[PDB]
Design a protein around this ligand. Structure first.
Ligand SMILES: [Mg+2]
Ligand SMILES: [Mg+2]
Lengths: 316, 316
């Protein structure tokens, strides 16, 4: 065929039970897109058995709970790996133990795992692809407040509340359409934006210990083992406050290094400049806009700063 | 008539020069709605003279600059007080010195100043009303990247990036339509989200000095004159960090009190509970969700806390 959506819905109508998967570390989209496809199907073919397997992140518990698959249901069922770049990165690994495999994602097509592959690279999120799918079957009536909830939240998180560049006029329109359904976005949004007061004091530290260039283009934060225990926080926890300096006016590149003990795992992100470049120089790597390195000392951490800062000289 | 939009466009076509106004303390909407109506008109009747008067807030300088009216142009011209609850709160006061007055706003109609009054109470923002207006004249083609810019930014700020409850599915749709025009929202958005690193250290203090109830429902911050000079910041500046604790999980009501010297001007905001109530008890007042009081001591500040906290006992 040429209209993959139809071939999917077909494979679906011909299976009494289908289970959906998503990548490992879950995000609002990976959550909404999964629970969404599910909630949708369950509304269209109540005679079938739709399940969503996953580790279940308590962080997204409010979006919806997952299902406990008995691994023997994979016998004669259709597996749908929703939102997942590469297969190994799929959550439950018994997905390949189904009748046929079908994947829906919005990341660059490099794996193409699964029989039928539909990747709308230009989509803001998989949730969005799901809305497109159900919208292609005029089921915008069969859907309700429960389904739209996840789909919204999904698009919301994957685009940071329609802020990121991946937000298109269509994305808005879809968001527009979901809000039609009664569910109160303001509420849902807040419960998603909640924060732990426990970590707030530390975050204040980050704000009190900067490191901006005279030009404001470069900014760093050294989290010494001392502060890690002074504020009583694990190296992991503190490492989530990277973008706590991103909003500084004029900031072009910033690095956040927290000492784990025998190495200083530093996460480096830039406004929009090839950075993973220098990352490799130090044995690191990653996306050109958000890479990571694991120096063995602050003296080396500084060499990284010097290398990063020099990158700003080529641009002006 | 019954279709105010037409009566406006009429009064417009019959005036070689029209000037637009907005309320005093400007906001992104009041800015976008003004510059927007203007930029629009200037595209429709280049033969006329459209001007936008205002004090000009350097904060919104990037949205667009205002015009310097010679007060004698008001001779035979149409004045359009865009986005402004009450007349006294209008910026340039020589507005009443025009041929006829016409106002467009989205706040409750309590003033009704001006000949023709159009208030879409259910609109997310005046900018949105402007899009509606131009959209009613099929001028979505005459408009360009420059006009949509302000209108977007306007809706954006007035709804905090489609987060507030005033965000409707139509609001999204309008946002959707504006993005069609080439202007890059991501960029524009950031320049609007920029922050001053100068105040960041202090903000860290606020995060390091909370005051949450055992239930997390109540939170306060006492900004003593000491810290006001320890971090070298004016009482005004520090007072803008009220909602710096709003995202705490479970927070229902919070107060932020900063000592100005001979009085402690405290701004009190709640999640969604009638609060201006207690405000009056202390000689204050304001909206039920964001009021203000000016106690003469921290001992009194505490009485306010007690009164506010007791308000949480009636609800559960
Ligand atoms: Mg995704
Ligand atoms: Mg407004």
């Amino acid at each position: 065929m040429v209209e993959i959506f139809n071939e999917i819905m077909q494979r679906v109508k011909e299976a009494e039970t289908i289970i959906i998967h998503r990548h490992v570390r879950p995000d609002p989209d990976a959550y909404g897109s999964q629970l969404g496809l599910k909630l949708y199907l369950e509304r269209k073919f109540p005679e079938k058995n739709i399940y969503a397997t996953g580790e279940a992140e308590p962080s997204l518990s409010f979006i919806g709970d997952l299902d406990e698959i008995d691994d023997s249901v994979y016998s004669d069922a259709l597996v749908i790996v929703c939102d997942t770049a590469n297969a190994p990165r799929i959550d439950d690994q018994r997905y390949l133990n189904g009748q046929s495999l079908i994947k829906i994602d919005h990341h660059p097509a490099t794996d193409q795992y699964g029989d039928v592959n539909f990747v709308n690279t230009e989509a803001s999120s998989t949730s969005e692809i799901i809305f497109d799918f159900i919208s292609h079957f005029n089921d915008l009536s069969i859907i309700d407040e429960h389904v739209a909830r996840v789909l919204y939240l999904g698009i919301v998180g994957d685009t940071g509340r329609f802020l990121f560049s991946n937000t298109s006029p269509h994305t808005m329109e879809v968001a527009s359409q979901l809000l039609a359904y009664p569910f109160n976005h303001n509420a849902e949004l807040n419960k998603m934006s909640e924060k732990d007061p426990k970590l707030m004091p530390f975050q204040g530290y980050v704000l009190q210990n900067f490191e901006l260039s005279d030009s404001h283009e470069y900014c760093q934060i050294k989290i010494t083992n001392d502060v890690l225990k002074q504020f009583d926080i694990q190296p992991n926890e503190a490492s989530q406050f990277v973008n706590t300096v991103a909003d500084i006016s004029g900031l072009k590149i910033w690095m956040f290094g927290v000492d784990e003990g025998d190495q200083i795992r530093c996460r480096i992100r830039s406004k929009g400049i090839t950075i993973n470049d220098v990352a490799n120089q130090f044995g690191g790597g990653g996306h050109p806009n958000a890479s990571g390195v694991s120096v063995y000392s602050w003296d080396e951490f500084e060499e990284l700063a010097q290398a990063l800062r020099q990158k700003l000289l080529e641009h002006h």
